[PDB]
């Protein structure tokens, strides 16, 4: 039917895998096993359309990408709200996306994850400002509670549809 190729990128430990696994498998991964490159598939109905999501869960750790990202149609750019450095490095991921796609207009959503945690160093307004400069939505999530998880991924699908 209708297939959407989604790619999740961002710094090591920000919760890329936990987000993807919550969406697809409906549980929270508490442990931290660094990812190399994993993929997930699932059929879902989004706004009345039956569709297939193909989700690529990428590595954040420099040790553990460009080739995999090439076929991506939309990207979640993830940072954690308790990790200022992960936010500051979002530009690096966007730059990589623009290179692999050879376009300055690629569907993306900015995601501030771990919103259940109280040691916040990135305020919502700061992230909204970054997103606005890129012309994309900002959404906060918790892979732990499931807050915003479906919204983040489904919003990305709706961004691809505007492309």
Q: Is 22 strand, coil or helix?
A: helix
Tell whether residue 104 is a contact of Ca ion (CB under 5 A): no
**The one among 4, 6, 7, 14 contacting ligand GNP by CB under 6 A:** 14
* Number of neighbouring beta carbons within 10 Å of residue 109: 25
The interface region with Ca ion, picked from 5-13, 21-29, 45-53, 145-153 by CB under 5 A, is 21-29
Spatial separation of the C-alpha atoms in residues 94 and 149, rounded to whole Å: 21
119 φ/ψ angles, rounded to the nearest 5 degrees? -85, 60
Partner from Ca ion, Mg ion, ligand GNP, none contacting 102, C-beta within 5 to 8 A by type = Ca ion
Residues within window 64-93 making contact with ligand GNP, judged by CB under 6 A: none
Radius of gyration (C-alpha) of the chain in whole angstroms: 14
60 is in an annotated binding site: yes
Q: How far is the CB of 9 from Ca ion (least distance, A)?
A: 16
Q: How many residues bind ligand GNP (CB under 6 A)?
A: 23
Q: Are 138 and 152 in contact (CB under 8 A)?
A: no
Contact pattern for ligand GNP over residues 16 through 55, marking x by CB under 6 A: xxx----------xxxx-xx--------------------
Q: How far is the CB of 129 from Ca ion (least distance, A)?
A: 28
Q: Are 73 and 3 in contact (CB under 8 A)?
A: no
């Amino acid at each position: 039917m209708t297939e959407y190729k989604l790619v999740v990128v961002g710094a090591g430990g920000v919760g890329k895998s936990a987000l993807t696994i919550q969406l697809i498998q409906n549980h929270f991964v508490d442990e931290y096993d660094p990812t190399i490159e994993d993929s997930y598939r699932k059929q879902v109905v989004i706004d009345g359309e039956t569709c297939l999501l193909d989700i690529l869960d990428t590595a954040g750790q420099e040790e553990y990408r460009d080739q995999y990202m090439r076929t991506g149609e939309g990207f979640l750019c993830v940072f954690a709200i308790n990790n200022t450095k992960s936010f500051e490095d979002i530009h690096q991921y966007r730059e990589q996306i623009k290179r692999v796609k050879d376009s300055d207009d690629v569907p993306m959503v900015l995601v501030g994850n771990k919103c259940d945690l109280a040691a916040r160093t990135v305020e919502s307004r700061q992230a909204q400002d970054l997103a606005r400069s890129y012309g994309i939505p900002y959404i906060e999530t918790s892979a732990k509670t499931r807050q915003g998880v479906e919204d983040a991924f489904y919003t990305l699908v709706r961004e691809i549809r505007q492309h």
